[PDB]
Design a protein around this ligand. Structure first.
Ligand SMILES: NC(=O)C1=CN([C@@H]2O[C@H](COP(=O)(O)OP(=O)(O)OC[C@H]3O[C@@H](n4cnc5c(N)ncnc54)[C@H](O)[C@@H]3O)[C@@H](O)[C@H]2O)C=CC1
Ligand SMILES: NC(=O)C1=CN([C@@H]2O[C@H](COP(=O)(O)OP(=O)(O)OC[C@H]3O[C@@H](n4cnc5c(N)ncnc54)[C@H](O)[C@@H]3O)[C@@H](O)[C@H]2O)C=CC1
Ligand SMILES: NC(=O)C1=CN([C@@H]2O[C@H](COP(=O)(O)OP(=O)(O)OC[C@H]3O[C@@H](n4cnc5c(N)ncnc54)[C@H](O)[C@@H]3O)[C@@H](O)[C@H]2O)C=CC1
Ligand SMILES: NC(=O)C1=CN([C@@H]2O[C@H](COP(=O)(O)OP(=O)(O)OC[C@H]3O[C@@H](n4cnc5c(N)ncnc54)[C@H](O)[C@@H]3O)[C@@H](O)[C@H]2O)C=CC1
Lengths: 404, 406, 406, 403
């Protein structure tokens, strides 16, 4: 049975995804290096139970809704904005992704980036390439003994810190919440302190309304003269022209930016920033999280998630679905996804009692529009298959399945 | 203290402030401080009456200039290189030269870490493309440093510090050296360079400039490096065959390089730079700034002020680059020194002068090179006797210079 | 908050204060704190109107005591062990029991380091020699721990932590586990237990108790051990064949050992302890104090208080050692819980009611052990509807306890 | 190089032998233990180099009849078992190993504080008697605790690093300002250190500044319920006061490895008022007694004898003027002599006359004696006549041509 369950993988996900699939028993895998055109996409997805895609493939309403057999969708990536998360929820297909798999990559990028900035290496290299030699030591520093101020002490600030400390930098941080320090990191309660003390400032924050432009003319002029600004969290967090200002003012020595409010949609599309005129700014194409090793983690994680769901019904971490997860105990497990009618649960429970079946466990979780419930029962294939078909006749029923 | 005040220290070229702090602490307070270089003209003027000089790599102390200063005792290269100073001519006049050969250790190790971090990410190519309107975001062939193998070639002061910083970052560290060296942390000596080249994700060079290292990284070797690997050189301009490096990068056998030193380099920051490596967005080129930081300058300042101060106080030429190295521990009595050409009978005039004043020599350190000879002598005696002996010493044929240091 | 004042916490055997700060930090204030153990008249007396109780290892909660505790909602064993508690008995009554399985971690790793350092150094013997008046200065046989190899048998909470500290000190760290573990730091998993016994200078046991571990370190395993090596068992009393170790100690195949646990241990600090290990000055014997520290007692106070708090506030039996495990995140509404013998028709009545009273179910999590079942039900509605429902819930034939939690 | 005889008595580490073998010196009379007076006299009577430990006594009488002997090697730190004077008179330098066990002392301290903070020594002593005493009250983890180090030199410095890798916070007191390593904080007043520390350890030298610097007062200023560890010197702690403070329970325990008076050997009785305290570790001065240190000493002191014989370095000799000369083309000769006028004048005259250029020379004196190394550019024959002539300067204790 498991090997009649087809995974469609596009955009060159990492091999380990494929390894995990196969070791879980899912050996039916149509895999693609690039993205597919419209007519091939619909061809390959017409009968896929699962799909793993990444940034570029668009699962629009129409695409999802022609996908006849689609059980869940796996964004092997961070973003899910290429998927109709809500079209998908109406057909009862959850969407998973990998939000915290890039951590070491971003941390590393930053460390690498600051080392070079503190030295004026970006600037020296740009001149070098056009035949201008600029050997000077004025302005330049080792990072050892410098103060690094991390704004955003989440999954990434944490690891950034640990590295910064590995290199003997002094580590201070600001987060709108009280965070337990690792090694000898130090929490600064006010942001204007952190800015003042810090030789380099790094942002590691979510894209919310506390963060839109959290760094303006104001905040930046608060920063130490000669300092460095690093942004590789979100494109909206920093007011580019402000920093452009502060960079010609030479109030800042330089900067690195891996994200922008606006980004080229493909790589053939042009890039535009005013920062593009500063040799002392590292400008990178949102590759903060782009490494093979990151790809391997996203591989392990989003396959892992698809498989768990397929095998156990778990929606822990699904982005568009009520979150359920029940531990394994002996018996059969079934599951019902449905509109939020009242008395679906009354309907469900009546079914098992009629058949004289004990419900070992169940977990119903509701969102505004939908409901998902996983029920364990002690019974045989015959019995479970009838409950199944009965469960499929409940009013509201979007989808239901015997998982084992 | 009133006798210190007489010794002109001239520091040009903007040496670190802690150099002056170190003079002052040692009593030497008369100092002509210049932030920049001086022309032919105000050189010879500020120097004329100058006991000690401090230059970096732009002041040119050539023969004529060295002949011009009527009172120069030592020279302090507050940098590594000494090629800007005619070593064989301060020697001729009995002026030892000093420098700071290893005051740049962290700075170079730090720089290499940053470079390899960004090169494994295809960041330099990304930044160049980005700054000209090209976006190119992809994950293929970009990698993290952690878990990667670093191949350090030349495991001396810098290799070693580089290695330490590298394993702190998660890298497995290997090295090759022509001598057998004791590893720190989990570094590993590799017996063949071809072994080390075949394995490394990154190879970084910290060897010295000499026949063995001249073009030691040539075609054959680059060819032995791992496909998709990285070449880094912040050692010497003559270690890597650059045309070869260029041909490897063009055929994508190497995926990047960072080079800080070149066969030939620009003499000032107004002199243009060229290299066949300029055509590559995936190569960091930096203008010999491996050891160019303020921490490094601070280190050089203390090192060399100390050497100059020590020479002045106790006559040590330990570490001097063009001069016989003598030093003797302070040890009760009066101390003299005597720099001479190796004339027959100099030593023999030296002890008769003391014999002939019934003066006991508690200590004597004599060292020579080709025609030069430096000897420092520690004596139990009066001052008038110490001053008298000095006069006698100064008249010995072959005597370049001699001084009663205390 | 006046609601809470009703709910009596009975703490015996003197648990750490941090337990009381959580308790009071959560509006929970009727606390009957005791430092010591209680006798039966003291216990029934002081438990009869207890809503919760925290005890330790000496308090014996039997069926006759439990079937007396009239208001007993849950039981916290402020400890690792639960053998002093009658789990089936409290399960029969719908009383979760909780504990702190992994709260002693650092306290055990810290002990083993101290011990291995002094053992390698032959300190226990020199100490006992000194106190008896004998001076034994030697260097034959003593070692620093840096660069020696630690074999950890059981690579879990304590093992992992043990290896981290050991690496801090420069030891080489190897482990053998029955399952495949991700090694921390530079830790190395050894696949065959015999190579590990073969290479290791010190071997420290950190495994559970069970047939797979029982006497798992016997005469065979002891001889696989490196000459002049050291054994340390602070896991469980059944894992080492003490008389085998005693023989290997007598024969000097081993240099020493540290045993904190024993097949038979005194019931109280008043009962004598005997061991054929008592004869050997080069063995540390410790009265099962592996996890006995104040920091550990404070880990415990926090973990176990938090849990009893969480259960009283939100139903969570996540972690119970004798009860179905249920947990639901919070959001908008009110929340019921319901404990019942699993009887025909319970879930049917539950849902019949909700539709009698017109209540829409937001979330529901039911789990069961054998005849026992526990369901926690979030519903959206106002307090009259709620408590209308819960009164019907207690009427369902089978119900053991139902509470409108919030 | 085979004609040179080394006598190593008392089981110096095998790295000493491995090194002599490397440097091409193979004639070795090795002895696991100490020689009694006749054997010693017979093995040494032709030895060039003796390497001993702390039990051997090279007295004048033995040294003096020691015919072929050129340098002495204490594979140890003490040189009080060696008559340094008798040895100089005869121009025999004495080498030893000043600091070869810093880690060993730091380790002992870490293990001791960790157990002592757990009451493990008492607990263990009780368990050896039948008494079980399981308790958490008063037992403490090391991490998060204040360790106060008194004396921040080789060993203090090191100990604070370990302590830090354990999670302790490290404070220190030193009579001078020092650069703290890691998170170490220098503490300007002894009393302030004493009050704050959960565990105090000592690493000062033996001198008046140091005698009983920890007395009734200082102990009473230690935090109630803290620990004192001394592996420094026997003269640093007022022991009776410590006793008192363990008796009154102001201190929860101590560890003492050094004592005002120590048995001379393992066979002599050891006594002490602390012996009655199960919560006190007592150790027979083994803070440095480990194989790693014995090996470190092995390379070091073998290193120094090899160096003296190959090139004449007397750097670190404890009884001799220190002279050292880098090496250069030519021959090298050596003169040791009584410090008195014109030796150097006749030395130098010898080379003047045979018309031989002196490439360098280094002489250094004491009050009573003088040593000088000479690099000359000449064939072997001329160096020989020179030797013979230098051997004759009145004043000459000894002269040798090294290469
Ligand atoms: N450039 C790239 O390729 C990638 C960018 N990122 C971005 O990095 C950001 C953070 O990453 P994680 O560490 O995984 O997030 P996280 O959720 O684990 O941590 C973010 C932290 O910022 C804190 N925070 C939230 N609002 C704040 C406010 N505005 N002011 C100060 N602190 C605030 C939160 O407390 C949290 O600690 C996200 O935007 C993520 O998308 C992550 C991976 C790759
Ligand atoms: N670009 C820059 O800013 C600067 C460049 N440098 C250069 O870095 C180089 C290394 O500096 P340090 O580590 O301080 O020197 P170092 O002398 O301490 O280390 C050099 C090591 O290389 C080994 N070696 C010699 N020849 C070799 C060969 N043929 N193959 C392999 N190994 C060989 C030696 O045994 C020695 O261990 C020097 O050339 C120095 O001038 C140093 C500072 C700055
Ligand atoms: N002396 C004392 O006061 C204390 C003793 N302990 C005991 O120490 C032991 C370990 O504690 P934790 O680290 O929390 O346990 P843990 O469960 O986290 O670690 C046990 C590890 O050993 C492995 N293992 C199981 N059977 C094995 C076998 N036959 N051979 C090799 N490995 C095996 C398991 O797979 C697991 O990874 C437990 O027995 C615990 O009761 C715990 C606290 C204090
Ligand atoms: N029991 C044993 O096996 C051994 C004992 N020791 C003893 O340990 C002691 C320390 O050894 P090292 O670290 O090698 O010595 P060290 O010379 O490196 O350090 C001594 C430090 O103590 C300081 N000091 C001197 N007088 C002081 C005072 N009154 N108050 C505070 N600080 C003072 C000095 O500033 C110096 O920093 C020495 O006595 C040594 O003999 C050393 C090795 C082994």
């Amino acid at each position: 049975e498991k090997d009649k369950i087809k995974f469609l993988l596009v955009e060159g996900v990492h091999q380990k995804a494929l390894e995990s699939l196969r070791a879980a028993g899912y050996t039916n895998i149509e895999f693609h290096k690039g993205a597919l055109d419209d007519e091939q996409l619909k061809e390959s997805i017409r009968d896929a139970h699962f799909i793993g895609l990444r940034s570029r493939t668009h699962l629009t309403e129409d695409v999802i809704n022609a996908a006849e057999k689609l059980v869940a969708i796996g964004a092997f990536a961070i973003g899910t904005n290429q998927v109709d998360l809500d079209a998908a929820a109406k057909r009862g297909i959850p969407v998973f992704n990998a939000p915290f798999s890039n951590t070491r990559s971003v941390a590393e990028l930053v460390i690498g980036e600051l080392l070079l900035l503190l030295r004026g290496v970006p600037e020296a290299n740009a001149k070098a390439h056009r035949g201008v030699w600029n050997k000077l030591a004025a302005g330049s520093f080792e990072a050892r003994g410098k103060k690094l101020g991390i704004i955003g002490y989440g999954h990434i600030g944490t690891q950034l810190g640990i590295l910064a400390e590995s290199l003997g930098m002094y580590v201070y941080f600001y987060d709108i919440e009280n965070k337990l320090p690792l090694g000898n990191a130090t929490q600064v309660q006010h942001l204007s302190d952190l800015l003042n003390m810090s030789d380099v400032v790094s942002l590691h924050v979510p894209e919310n309304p506390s963060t839109k432009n959290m760094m303006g003319a104001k905040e930046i002029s608060l920063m130490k003269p000669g300092s460095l600004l690093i942004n590789a969290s979100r494109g909206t967090v920093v007011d580019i022209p402000a920093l452009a200002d502060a960079l010609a003012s030479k109030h800042l020595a330089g900067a690195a930016i891996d994200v922008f409010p606006t980004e080229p949609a493909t790589n053939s599309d042009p890039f535009t920033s005013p920062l593009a005129e500063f040799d002392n700014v590292l400008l990178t194409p949102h590759i903060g999280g782009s490494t093979q090793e990151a790809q391997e983690n996203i591989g392990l994680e989003v396959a892992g998630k698809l498989i768990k769901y397929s095998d156990n019904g778990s929606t822990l971490s699904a982005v568009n679905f009520p979150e359920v997860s029940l531990p394994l105990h002996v018996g059969r497990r079934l599951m019902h996804i449905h509109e939020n009618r009242p008395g679906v649960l009354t309907a469900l429970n009546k079914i098992f009692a009629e058949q004289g079946v004990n419900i070992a466990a169940q977990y119903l979780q509701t969102s505004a529009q939908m409901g998902y419930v996983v029920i364990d029962i002690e019974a045989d294939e015959d019995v479970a298959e009838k409950a199944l078909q009965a469960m499929k006749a409940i009013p509201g029923t979007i989808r239901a399945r015997l998982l084992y």
